[PDB]
């Protein structure tokens, strides 16, 4: 199917507690495969998936050089953005960046992404054309001028259409037994009385990969979007994910409710009911 690669950077200042920390993590879909942390005892790019371990020392040294240089660049950027917003030297601030490439089921580039935020708010983003920018405010317009001068958009477009897709396809091949394997959810419906007149129906989905899933409750074939308690999809810690959806139903009407499950790993979508 469809696949993506993303790098996530977090740069966080901490006045009076040393220089800003820089974190980089890399993902293919919902699988992390690398980490870099400037606070580590010996900062170096480390593997976080078994299929990346086969990469040679030149790969690891190249990644570490890039992240060590980004650690320095982001310290300068934090200083600059503090100035752009006329902020005091006392508070802790964060720059985040998320970028990467999306492939379609044919392996071709669907689109590229490059987005930055400041204190959790959109700051600057590379437009879908991979040539122009969307600056959130007059501070981000200063960054936009600097990035145009360094021809950042052109360098990003070359990477997103080039190295990004090439390395993503390499990883998908090297890790094909897990990255190209969709594990369907294991499902069940639980029933718990909340009173004499009402009961909770909980529809579970366990052990699935990737994290993308649709869990809905219907009453007489009508979506119960408003009355459904949906927990955020959560990691199991073994690469798989979990989710549940619950509805409080009148006692005796349980059979009017159906749980619907959509996931990439299922031979066919599921319709489940409480089985007393």
């Amino acid at each position: 199917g469809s696949h993506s690669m993303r790098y996530f950077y977090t740069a966080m200042s901490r006045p009076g507690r040393g220089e800003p920390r820089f974190i980089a993590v890399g993902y293919v879909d919902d699988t992390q495969f690398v980490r870099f942390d400037s606070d580590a005892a010996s900062p170096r790019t480390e593997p976080r998936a078994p299929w990346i371990e086969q990469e040679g020392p030149e790969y690891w040294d190249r990644n570490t050089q890039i992240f060590k240089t980004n650690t320095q660049t982001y310290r300068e950027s934090l200083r600059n953005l503090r100035g752009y917003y006329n902020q005091s030297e006392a508070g802790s601030h964060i720059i985040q960046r998320m970028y990467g490439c999306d492939l379609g089921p044919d392996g071709r580039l669907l689109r590229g992404h490059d987005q930055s935020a400041y204190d959790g708010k959109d700051y600057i983003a590379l437009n879908e054309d991979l040539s122009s920018w969307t600056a959130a405010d007059t501070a981000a317009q200063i960054t936009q001028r600097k990035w145009e001068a360094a021809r950042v958009a052109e360098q990003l477009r070359a990477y997103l259409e080039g190295l990004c897709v090439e390395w993503l396809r390499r990883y998908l091949e090297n890790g094909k037994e897990t990255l190209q394997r969709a594990d369907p959810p294991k499902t069940h419906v639980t029933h718990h009385p909340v009173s004499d007149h009402e009961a909770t129906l909980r529809c579970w989905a366990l052990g699935f990969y990737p994290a993308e899933i649709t869990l809905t409750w219907q009453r007489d074939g009508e979506d119960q979007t408003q009355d459904t308690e949906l927990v955020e999809t959560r990691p199991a810690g073994d690469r798989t994910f979990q989710k549940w959806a619950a509805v409080v139903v009148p006692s005796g009407e349980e059979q009017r409710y159906t749980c619907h499950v959509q996931h990439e790993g299922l031979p066919k979508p599921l319709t489940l009911r409480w089985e007393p």
């Binding site: 790098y7 950077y9 980089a24 890399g26 790969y59 190249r62 990644n63 890039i66 992240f67 240089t69 980004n70 660049t73 982001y74 300068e76 950027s77 600059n80 953005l81 720059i95 960046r97 970028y99 930055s116 600057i124 960054t143 600097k146 990035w147 360094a150 950042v152 360098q155 990003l156 990477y159 190295l163 990004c164 390395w167």
Partner: peptide
């Protein structure tokens, strides 16, 4: 593989 540069903002 990551993008090779981060340009000062």
């Amino acid at each position: 593989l990551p993008f090779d540069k981060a340009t000062i903002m």
